[PDB]
Amino acid sequence: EECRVLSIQSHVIRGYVGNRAATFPLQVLGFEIDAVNSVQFSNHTGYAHWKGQVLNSDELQELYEGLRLNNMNKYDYVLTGYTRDKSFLAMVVDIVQELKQQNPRLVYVCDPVLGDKWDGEGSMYVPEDLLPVYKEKVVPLADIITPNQFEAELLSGRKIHSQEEALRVMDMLHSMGPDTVVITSSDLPSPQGSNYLIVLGSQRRSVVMERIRMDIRKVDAVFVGTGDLFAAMLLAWTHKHPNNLKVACEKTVSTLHHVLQRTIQCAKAQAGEGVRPSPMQLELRMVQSKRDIEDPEIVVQATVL
Amino acid sequence: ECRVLSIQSHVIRGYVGNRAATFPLQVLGFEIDAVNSVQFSNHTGYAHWKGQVLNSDELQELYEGLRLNNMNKYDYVLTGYTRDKSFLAMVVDIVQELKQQNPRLVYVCDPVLGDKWDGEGSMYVPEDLLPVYKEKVVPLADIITPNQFEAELLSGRKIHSQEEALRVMDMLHSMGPDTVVITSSDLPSPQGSNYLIVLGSQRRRNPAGSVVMERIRMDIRKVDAVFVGTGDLFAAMLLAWTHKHPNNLKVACEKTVSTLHHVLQRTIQCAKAQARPSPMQLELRMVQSKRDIEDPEIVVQATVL
Numbered sequence A: 001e002e003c004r005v006l007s008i009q010s011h012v013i014r015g016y017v018g019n020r021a022a023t024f025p026l027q028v029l030g031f032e033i034d035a036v037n038s039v040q041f042s043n044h045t046g047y048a049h050w051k052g053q054v055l056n057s058d059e060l061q062e063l064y065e066g067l068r069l070n071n072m073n074k075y076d077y078v079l080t081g082y083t084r085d086k087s088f089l090a091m092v093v094d095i096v097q098e099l100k101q102q103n104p105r106l107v108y109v110c111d112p113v114l115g116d117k118w119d120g121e122g123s124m125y126v127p128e129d130l131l132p133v134y135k136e137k138v139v140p141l142a143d144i145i146t147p148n149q150f151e152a153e154l155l156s157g158r159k160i161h162s163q164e165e166a167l168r169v170m171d172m173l174h175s176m177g178p179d180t181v182v183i184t185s186s187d188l189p190s191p192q193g194s195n196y197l198i199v200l201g202s203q204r205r206s207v208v209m210e211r212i213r214m215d216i217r218k219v220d221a222v223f224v225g226t227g228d229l230f231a232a233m234l235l236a237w238t239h240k241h242p243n244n245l246k247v248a249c250e251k252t253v254s255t256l257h258h259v260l261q262r263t264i265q266c267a268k269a270q271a272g273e274g275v276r277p278s279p280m281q282l283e284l285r286m287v288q289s290k291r292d293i294e295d296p297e298i299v300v301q302a303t304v305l
Numbered sequence B: 001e002c003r004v005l006s007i008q009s010h011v012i013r014g015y016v017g018n019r020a021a022t023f024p025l026q027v028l029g030f031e032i033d034a035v036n037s038v039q040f041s042n043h044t045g046y047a048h049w050k051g052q053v054l055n056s057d058e059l060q061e062l063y064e065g066l067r068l069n070n071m072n073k074y075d076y077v078l079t080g081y082t083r084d085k086s087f088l089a090m091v092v093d094i095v096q097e098l099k100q101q102n103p104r105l106v107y108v109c110d111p112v113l114g115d116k117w118d119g120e121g122s123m124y125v126p127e128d129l130l131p132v133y134k135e136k137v138v139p140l141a142d143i144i145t146p147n148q149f150e151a152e153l154l155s156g157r158k159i160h161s162q163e164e165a166l167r168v169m170d171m172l173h174s175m176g177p178d179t180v181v182i183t184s185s186d187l188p189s190p191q192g193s194n195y196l197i198v199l200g201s202q203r204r205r206n207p208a209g210s211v212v213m214e215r216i217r218m219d220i221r222k223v224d225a226v227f228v229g230t231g232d233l234f235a236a237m238l239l240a241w242t243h244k245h246p247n248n249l250k251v252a253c254e255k256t257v258s259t260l261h262h263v264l265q266r267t268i269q270c271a272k273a274q275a276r277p278s279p280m281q282l283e284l285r286m287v288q289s290k291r292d293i294e295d296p297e298i299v300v301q302a303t304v305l
């Protein structure tokens, strides 16, 4: 009847990040997703300016309490992403634990947002005290995690220089609890050329492993909200294709392809030839990608490792 | 691209305020930015509900952020249930500046003041809001959607018949808005007593330059239940379909009212099959009505007045 998702992420007025990047897509795919907005900002922090207010851990608990009092604390999935506050994350953990006791079959999709790699090596953009909570509290509770290379390294304590090392680090994260690990981006080399980024996916489930790889053509620009979109779409596609990590990843990545393809085109037309599109011009063309989200044309086959 | 700034309430579970208005508008291709005026666990018609509210200062701050980035350029502004006078005054100042930034901006205002329960009607917003609506908001509005009780409060006249309704509608036009739709009333229907009546009136200047007025009426059969959020959805869709059929109120209203019907029908059937349906079972089945929102099959035709 209904697949409900409790998604606790940022909200911006203008643009598509966090809950803004996750909601429309999931609703379009028929999920009863409920959005708890961890913050409400004018726009994402990639802009010259930004304003807003946050939601403290007490307010989050207050909201959970209202749902519980009405017996609306039964969800099929929980989805979380970027959080800057340690208190908030701990409160999130208590909530998932609770929702899990309420429904053992709940799937927690955790995007362990900690930072990223830029030119070569990267940096965190979350207070460091958060990492221990993610390693000790969050990830062990998670059923599906979506870190990028940097986050996978931080959560494992191991550096990743090759595909093999990435799969080993993924085995470590698996042992930490999550049955599905998908590294959403990395510096790994591709035979296709230098203009590619690699996605690796591992799923434990007769206990069998399924591992995949995808080589994605890089678009010349920095997008915001794509990691969030990736996690939400992975949530939707692993849902329709359980035990088929391959397809789930192909639909997720293809959906990202169409959205970004549509986004970079508009960004240019607006910026004009030879001019790099601004963050504003680079906002995901989300509503215009509705048909691509409903049924994405697979434009990337994933290789079975 | 058509940009809408919608300042209304947000709930975690259910569809009212920005939750009733956002998904449908996005489905229709509108770039709608949602400013959440409150964040509650659910709508206040449930046994319990908890949450926080946005104050006029935070609204001003969120707006300052859009402005600092030059993102205060909108085609439409949509407001609904507002609980605080200083908030409403802040909303008024915002709409003024936006209209200055763009003189073609259309302000769609749902002047939420109260309603009628059986025979008697009463307010559910601070009474000190009525003067602000009368002198500050409605004069800035291009499209208003009051229910019968609100048209009466705004006009200062009681409505006992179609004739009195049309006079208050002209009164409302003279206050400001070119489009006045009374979204519900207990006026008499030649089809029975179990009908609510919708009246619409739109003043526009045709190609030749003559100022004319289109007037319509719809007799909707009442369903046995109280829905929350349908008034919000009505305004949202009215915005969407008058945008599509700017010189045809009859069609705009027929698509708006037909969309509610399809939604309410699906909702009433997946509430009966659950049960009396409680507030939770009567939540608008928003996500499941996607197809109906995109292209509503017209099920009720309007009477030309």
Ligand SMILES: Nc1ncnc2c1ncn2[C@@H]1O[C@H](COP(=O)(O)OP(=O)(O)OP(=O)(O)O)[C@@H](O)[C@H]1O
Binding pocket: A111, A112, A113, A114, A115, A116, A146, A147, A148, A149, A151, A183, A184, A185, A199, A216, A217, A218, A219, A220, A221, A222, A223, A225, A226, A227, A228, A230, A253, A256, A257, A260
């Ligand atoms: N410049 C780009 N070119 C092509 N695809 C991109 C680009 N940026 C993002 N993507 C798409 O978005 C996905 C996620 O990458 P991103 O770098 O946006 O997230 P992450 O950094 O992997 O996630 P997060 O920081 O939220 O944990 C990539 O797998 C790819 O599908």
Ligand SMILES: Nc1ncnc2c1ncn2[C@@H]1O[C@H](COP(=O)(O)OP(=O)(O)OP(=O)(O)O)[C@@H](O)[C@H]1O
Binding pocket: B110, B111, B112, B113, B114, B115, B145, B146, B147, B148, B150, B182, B183, B184, B196, B198, B220, B221, B222, B223, B224, B225, B226, B227, B229, B230, B231, B232, B234, B257, B260, B261, B264
């Ligand atoms: N019980 C019902 N039976 C049939 N249709 C209904 C019913 N309730 C709401 N509707 C639909 O929703 C529309 C809006 O009515 P509602 O009473 O929901 O809002 P209002 O009270 O008219 O608006 P507001 O938000 O300004 O108070 C009606 O015109 C109709 O299309």
Ligand SMILES: Cc1ncc(COP(=O)(O)O)c(C=O)c1O
Binding pocket: A010, A017, A018, A044, A045, A046, A082, A223, A224, A225, A226, A227, A228, A229
């Ligand atoms: C507050 C906030 N939410 C969401 C996002 C989206 O993150 P990503 O670019 O990985 O999709 C960002 C990006 O930094 C952010 O700052």
Ligand SMILES: Cc1ncc(COP(=O)(O)O)c(C=O)c1O
Binding pocket: B009, B016, B017, B043, B044, B045, B081, B227, B228, B229, B230, B231, B232, B233
């Ligand atoms: C915060 C809020 N938003 C929206 C609504 C829904 O209004 P309506 O049923 O007139 O569309 C309500 C109900 O009173 C409400 O409390």
Ligand SMILES: [Mg+2]
Binding pocket: A116, A148, A185, A227
């Ligand atoms: Mg990245």
Ligand SMILES: [Mg+2]
Binding pocket: A018, A081, A082, A113, A225, A227, A228
């Ligand atoms: Mg992110």
Ligand SMILES: [Mg+2]
Binding pocket: B115, B147, B184, B231
């Ligand atoms: Mg009503």
Ligand SMILES: [Mg+2]
Binding pocket: B080, B081, B110, B112, B229, B231, B232
């Ligand atoms: Mg309302």
Ligand code: NA
Binding pocket: A111, A146, A147, A148, A184, A185, A227, A230
């Ligand atoms: Na990621």
Ligand code: NA
Binding pocket: B110, B145, B146, B147, B182, B183, B184, B231
């Ligand atoms: Na109304």
